[PDB]
Design a protein around this ligand. Structure first.
Ligand SMILES: [Ca+2]
Ligand SMILES: [Ca+2]
Ligand SMILES: [Ca+2]
Ligand SMILES: [Ca+2]
Ligand SMILES: [Ca+2]
Ligand SMILES: [Ca+2]
Ligand SMILES: [Ca+2]
Ligand SMILES: [Zn+2]
Lengths: 318, 65
């Protein structure tokens, strides 16, 4: 194993200064990563993998054989969120956060919408199979339940399907922050599910703070998505680009917000909406503390700007 | 055989229906009123006419970004 570095993207989103407050290791907090699966024994990941599930071909399997990453993409996205802060490899935005790895994409990185919807439900239901076990209407943030508080989707399709959207709406109403890649086609607006109002669409910047040419436009926020070193199978590291690499940076920032807020208050913040510019909502916080690049204000390239964890957490706690 | 997602009215739909048109149930959603079904490619129109069937949607593809 190589000695640990902090990838430039982690530095850019101002994560390291948060860690003295929280690394995301607050027990009620989990991030569900819906992707190609995970190298679950990776030395720089293993300790943070709380649950491994697969929804491929419409069957739910919790077997390691079925949940393991056959592509590399899931492992890479998961390390940007949650690679451990230790002496090896890399470090994630929220290096202590628990991960639920939900495999919705196959070996070739392709997925059916049906499997994705079922993946989203797994993040609501959690290992115990029940959304709201004590029936109080609190799901995300309820220490009695085991729902994820973030769903991270580094994937996208061109179709807007009624039933997938119904599932997104269920997660949103469960109090879950949903974050998805804007897409890599240089298109004028985001792919689905990023394009839904309930979901944070994420664009990609490069190390010069330029928007990547492939980044789908009109995102909500943007993050490091070019030359991103992270974990990769088997027990190794790789550098990749795309909106899929930007997404986990934002998911890690939300994890830090909700961890810090629960640590201080014993509750989590509401998800909020695209227009929110208050401090009273996860999305409002993201929007107002984002580094406003390009023309003043929200713009079609960067969205509100590059997320910044340090400032977001301070806005949450103050 | 193709995979399709049916949005249903639970008051008028029964999962045992789909056998009637040569299909079978893949997955019943707990959290939304929908069921994933494999049907013969040529029976989609027939499925749209089955009791309690509100919408039939093809199974679309997402890709890693
Ligand atoms: Ca491994
Ligand atoms: Ca490390
Ligand atoms: Ca549960
Ligand atoms: Ca509850
Ligand atoms: Ca409760
Ligand atoms: Ca949780
Ligand atoms: Ca701007
Ligand atoms: Zn079948």
């Amino acid at each position: 194993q190589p000695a640990q570095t902090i990838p430039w993207g982690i530095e850019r989103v101002k994560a390291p200064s948060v860690w003295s407050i929280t690394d995301g290791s607050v027990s009620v907090i989990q991030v569900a990563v819906l992707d190609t699966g995970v190298d679950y024994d990776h030395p720089d990941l293993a300790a943070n993998i709380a649950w491994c599930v697969s929804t491929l071909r419409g069957k739910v399997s919790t077997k390691l054989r079925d949940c393991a990453d056959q592509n590399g993409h899931g492992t890479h996205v998961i390390g940007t969120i949650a690679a451990l802060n230790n002496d090896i490899g890399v470090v994630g935005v929220a290096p202590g956060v628990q991960i639920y790895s939900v495999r919705v994409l196959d070996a070739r990185g392709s997925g059916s919408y049906s499997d994705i919807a079922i993946g989203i439900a797994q993040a609501i239901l959690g290992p115990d199979g029940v959304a709201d076990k004590d029936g109080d209407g609190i799901i995300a943030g309820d220490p009695d339940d085991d729902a994820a508080e973030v769903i991270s989707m580094s994937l996208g399709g061109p179709a807007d399907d009624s039933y997938l959207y119904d599932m997104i709406i269920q997660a949103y109403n469960a109090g879950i922050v949903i974050v998805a890649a804007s897409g890599n086609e240089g298109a004028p607006s985001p792919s689905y599910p990023a394009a839904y109002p309930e979901v944070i669409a994420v664009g990609a910047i490069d190390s010069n703070d330029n928007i990547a040419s492939f980044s789908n436009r009109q995102p909500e926020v943007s993050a490091p998505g070019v030359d991103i070193l992270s974990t990769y199978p088997d027990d190794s590291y790789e550098t990749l680009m795309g909106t899929a690499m930007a997404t986990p940076h934002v998911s890690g920032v939300v994890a830090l917000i909700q961890a810090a807020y629960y640590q201080k208050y014993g509750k989590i913040l509401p998800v909020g909406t695209f227009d929110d510019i208050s401090k009273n909502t996860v999305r409002g916080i993201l929007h107002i503390t984002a580094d406003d690049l390009g023309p003043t204000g929200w713009d079609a390239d960067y969205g509100y700007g590059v997320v910044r964890a340090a400032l977001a957490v301070q806005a949450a706690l103050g | 055989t193709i995979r399709v997602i049916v949005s249903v009215d639970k008051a008028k739909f029964n999962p045992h229906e789909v056998l009637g048109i040569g299909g079978h149930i893949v997955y019943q959603f707990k959290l939304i009123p929908a069921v994933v079904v494999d049907v013969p490619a040529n029976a989609v129109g027939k499925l749209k006419k089955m009791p309690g069937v509100e919408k039939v949607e093809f199974d679309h593809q997402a890709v890693l970004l």
